[PDB]
């Protein structure tokens, strides 16, 4: 953590393999205006002023989210310390004018992204023609900012900066928006290999470095408000045509 000058944040990293959140602190400097926006969020260029521990910001005043038993007591090891080290340029995302964004939802979005990141590794283990990867994402509590009209602290999510032409390959409701095979085959892979317990769609990013994915599950629970359940899964099916990569992976037509 550097001096000076920016704003402090509590930084949360989820680690799927121990199934725990890792709580840290960082300092960051964010541009006043967004460089981009989509249906739900605005994105801002940001630079890291370093990552440190959470010692100064005691947890549990009580009523915790995430609850204490979901939090690692040790945080010495994490991705943030290298990927957001001092001087790193990265992206910060805020929900637009939010009504429906509870605290739990931000953590849901980050966890969802980490799950998708596991699916990417699993896809890559089949050695397809093009490997894929999902970016890290983290929750940040912007503790230096005045709480909202309702007294909630300001939350956001952050992720690495993608350099290149950002493209959306499918949506979370049936749209197939480019001719590329790998993104559609990856979505189908997740459906079949999960035994239809889930699907990853809204495959989008620069080349095969993806971010902002969306998972549908049949019960429609969790995975944020973009989880459209069976309906989302079925929409994907109606517009999906298998391609050579699906064939290479031996997926059912
Ligand atoms: N990591 C990144 N690096 C560079 N640009 C990004 C990155 N993530 C998002 N963007 C840009 O910011 C825009 C909005 O971000 P994002 O897609 O995460 O939110 P959203 O648009 O609300 O989600 P959706 O469009 O799927 O509803 C994107 O459409 C893209 O132009
Ligand atoms: Zn297919």
Swiss-Prot record:
Residues where ATP binds? 224-229
Domain named Alpha-type protein kinase is located at 13-253
Renumbered to this chain, the signal peptide range is none
Report residue spans for region: Catalytic.
Answer: 1-253
Q: Which family does it belong to?
A: Belongs to the protein kinase superfamily. Alpha-type protein kinase family. ALPK subfamily.
Relate the assembly described in the record.
Oligomer.
Protein name per UniProt: Myosin heavy chain kinase A
Please tell me the species this chain comes from. Dictyostelium discoideum
């Amino acid at each position: 953590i550097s001096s000076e000058t920016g704003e402090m944040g509590i930084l949360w990293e989820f680690d799927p393999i121990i199934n725990k959140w890792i709580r840290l602190s960082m300092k960051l400097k964010v541009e006043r205006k967004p460089f981009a926006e989509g249906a739900l969020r605005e994105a801002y260029h940001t630079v890291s002023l370093g990552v440190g521990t959470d010692e100064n910001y005691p947890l549990g005043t009580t009523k915790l989210f995430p609850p204490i038993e979901m939090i690692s007591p040790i945080s010495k090891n994490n991705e943030a310390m290298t990927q957001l080290k001092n001087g790193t340029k990265f992206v910060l995302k805020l929900y637009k004018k939010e009504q429906q964004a509870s605290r739990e939802l931000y953590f849901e979005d980050v966890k969802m992204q980490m799950v998708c990141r596991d699916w990417g590794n699993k896809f890559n283990q089949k050695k397809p023609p093009k490997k894929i990867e999902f970016l890290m994402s983290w929750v940040v509590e912007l503790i230096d900012r005045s709480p909202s009209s309702n007294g909630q602290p300001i939350l956001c999510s952050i992720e690495p900066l993608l350099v290149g032409e950002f493209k959306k390959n499918n949506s979370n409701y049936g749209a197939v928006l480019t001719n590329r095979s790998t993104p559609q085959a990856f979505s189908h892979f997740t459906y079949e290999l999960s035994n239809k317990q889930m699907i990853v769609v809204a495959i989008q990013g620069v080349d095969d470095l993806y971010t902002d994915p969306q998972i549908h599950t049949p019960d429609g629970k969790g995975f944020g408000l973009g989880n459209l359940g069976k309906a989302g899964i079925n929409k994907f099916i109606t517009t999906h045509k298998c391609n050579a990569v699906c064939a290479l992976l031996d997926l059912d037509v």
